[PDB]
């Protein structure tokens, strides 16, 4: 009966594993958006080349 | 290389011989120290009686710490614990060689290892047949009070009610400023003071065009020999050779101190009652109680004080 902590990468570190974990954080804010406008707004709000 | 090289006691010893040498060196400490336990049966020097104006030897002790203490009047006295530890008489000079009117006895306490010491010090002790001691000190002793070298000294050499003087090196404070070294006021915090808060003010006057010798300036504070005068002895523990001395003693805990009868005017010839040459336990004239107290002291295990 030992509650080992989940083996996941840190959220704040400066690595590739930690970046891919901050990507799922915003991606989850789309999953959890009720309306389709919010989903499309989140997916397109940030402009890049 | 055909040049100087460094060595220490452990460099060439094997794993087994490392333990063997440690046990051997400690073995020698045991036998040597038990040889000198009986001064009076080893050709003791003649024991002269006390005459007025005599000064007897003192002891070197280690500073254990402090504790509270109470008197039958209910007052609380902070007291310091001094342990007499491997204290032996080491060297004797006569009045002529010391160049003083009085003679000198060098005592030493707190036996130490033999492994990082100069050959000179080790030879000095090998002649005397003692393990090396941490520190030497010199005591001024009159001719009647001379004691043969190699004679151990014990806390019972002092008795409750006598006043004593302790000298030891003070705690070092490193390089310090002028406020903490000499208690200078300093300068204001605000109202326009620019980069001058803890600084010394004007060194001197404009006329003399120099700084007087002995002007107080920033420097290294502490680590100096200081002495405290007129400290009462409240109690002596004969089993552990502990002396209870009123008030504070210079130095840190585990610091070696020099204990000798007080030189203040009041207690000029108080050593009449005390063992004049020294306290000999080998004589065994009467066996001392484990704890010696001063009459005013309220001993623990006594009934609670009721100022009826």
């Amino acid at each position: 009966v030992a509650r080992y902590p989940p083996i996941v990468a840190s959220m704040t570190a400066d690595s590739k594993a930690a970046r891919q974990r901050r990507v799922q954080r915003w991606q989850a804010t789309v999953h959890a958006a009720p309306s389709v406008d919010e989903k499309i707004r989140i997916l397109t709000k940030m402009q890049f080349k | 290389l055909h040049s100087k090289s460094s060595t220490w006691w452990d460099e060439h010893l094997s794993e087994e011989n490392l333990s063997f040498v440690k046990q051997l060196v400690s073995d020698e400490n045991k036998t040597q120290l038990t040889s000198k336990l009986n001064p009076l049966k080893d050709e003791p020097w003649p024991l002269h009686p006390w005459e007025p104006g005599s000064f007897r030897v003192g002891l070197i002790a280690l500073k254990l710490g402090m504790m509270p203490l109470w008197t039958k009047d209910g007052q609380k006295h902070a007291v310091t614990l001094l342990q007499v530890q491997d204290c032996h008489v080491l060297k004797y000079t006569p009045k002529e060689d010391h160049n003083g009117k009085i003679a000198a006895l060098t005592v030493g306490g707190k036996t130490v290892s033999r492994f990082y010491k100069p050959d000179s010090r080790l030879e000095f002790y090998r002649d005397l047949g003692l393990p090396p001691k941490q520190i030497h000190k010199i005591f001024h002793v009159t001719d009647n009070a001379v004691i043969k070298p190699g004679t151990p000294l014990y806390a019972a050499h002092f008795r409750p009610g006598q006043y004593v003087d302790v000298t030891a090196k003070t705690i070092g404070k490193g390089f310090q400023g002028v406020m903490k070294r000499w208690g200078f006021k300093g300068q204001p915090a605000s109202h326009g003071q620019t980069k001058t808060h803890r600084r010394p003010g004007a060194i001197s006057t404009g006329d003399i065009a120099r700084v007087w010798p002995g002007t107080k300036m920033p420097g290294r504070m502490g680590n100096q020999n200081r002495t405290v005068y007129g400290l009462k002895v409240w109690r002596v523990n004969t089993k552990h050779n502990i002396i209870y001395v009123n008030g504070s003693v210079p130095g840190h805990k585990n610091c070696l101190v020099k204990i000798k009868d007080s030189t203040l005017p009041a207690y000029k010839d108080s050593c009449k009652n005390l063992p004049f040459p020294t306290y000999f336990p080998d004589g065994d004239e009467e066996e001392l109680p484990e704890d010696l107290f001063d009459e005013s002291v309220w001993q623990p295990s006594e009934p609670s004080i009721t100022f009826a």
Binding site: - | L64, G65, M67, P68, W70, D73, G74, K76, L81, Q83, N237, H240, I242, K253, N254, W298, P300, S301, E302, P303, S304, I305, T306, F307, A308
Partner: protein
């Protein structure tokens, strides 16, 4: 097994012999006078002989707000309010003019310091001088009183909300808005509790000390 705190040595470079010498003296006084078991927050009545009179006795009853000291110099503070005037006396357990110590009410409180009771309402500080002792159960654990006191206006003796005090006995919700509680958390040092070289483990020392105390009996 309740080992009185004063027996536990503080860490440092002082010799163990200095402690052994003191313990023997401490045990000697305890035989003459019995020092009851008590904790911070328990109410005590201490009868001491006054030195300003002819051995006449004085009595003071209060809650033990603080316990501190090692060896024969250990002390405990206890507060009360008399005719609407708070007073605190810092008694010395081994002072030879303490005639008797009676634990009127034995209990434990959420914190081991109750200095904040200076800023709490007077009710939490006032205790009846004439109150009779309450029963105790030896083969039981001491009760832990979980009372959370109510404070008077914010200007306090100290900043009890700050994380260094770690007070768990004050109703911070009533007296402080969440904005203040958030701001006060800017003085929090989360690493302190998790650095292993700052913890002084006394289990072995307590075990050896407990055996010696019983052996002397």
């Amino acid at each position: 097994r309740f080992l009185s705190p004063e027996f536990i040595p503080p860490r440092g470079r002082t010799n163990p012999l200095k402690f052994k010498i003191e313990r023997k003296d401490m045990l000697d006084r305890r035989k003459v006078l019995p020092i009851p078991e008590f904790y911070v927050g328990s109410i005590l009545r201490v009868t001491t002989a006054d030195p300003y009179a002819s051995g006449k006795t004085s009595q003071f009853l209060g809650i033990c707000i603080k316990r501190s000291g090692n060896g024969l110099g250990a002390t405990f503070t206890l507060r009360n309010t008399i005719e609407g005037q708070g007073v605190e006396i810092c008694f010395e357990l081994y002072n030879p003019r303490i005639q008797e110590i009676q634990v009127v009410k034995l209990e434990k409180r959420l914190d081991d310091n109750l200095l904040y009771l200076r800023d709490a309402l007077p009710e939490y500080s006032t205790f009846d001088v004439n109150m009779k002792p309450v029963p105790q159960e030896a083969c039981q654990e001491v009760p832990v009183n979980k009372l959370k006191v109510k404070m008077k206006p914010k200007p306090w003796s100290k900043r009890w909300e700050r994380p260094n005090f770690n007070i768990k006995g004050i109703r911070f919700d009533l007296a402080l808005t969440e904005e203040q509680m958030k701001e006060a958390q800017k003085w929090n040092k989360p690493w302190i509790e998790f650095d292993m070289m700052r913890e002084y483990d006394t289990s072995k020392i307590e075990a050896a000390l407990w055996e010696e105390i019983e052996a002397s009996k």
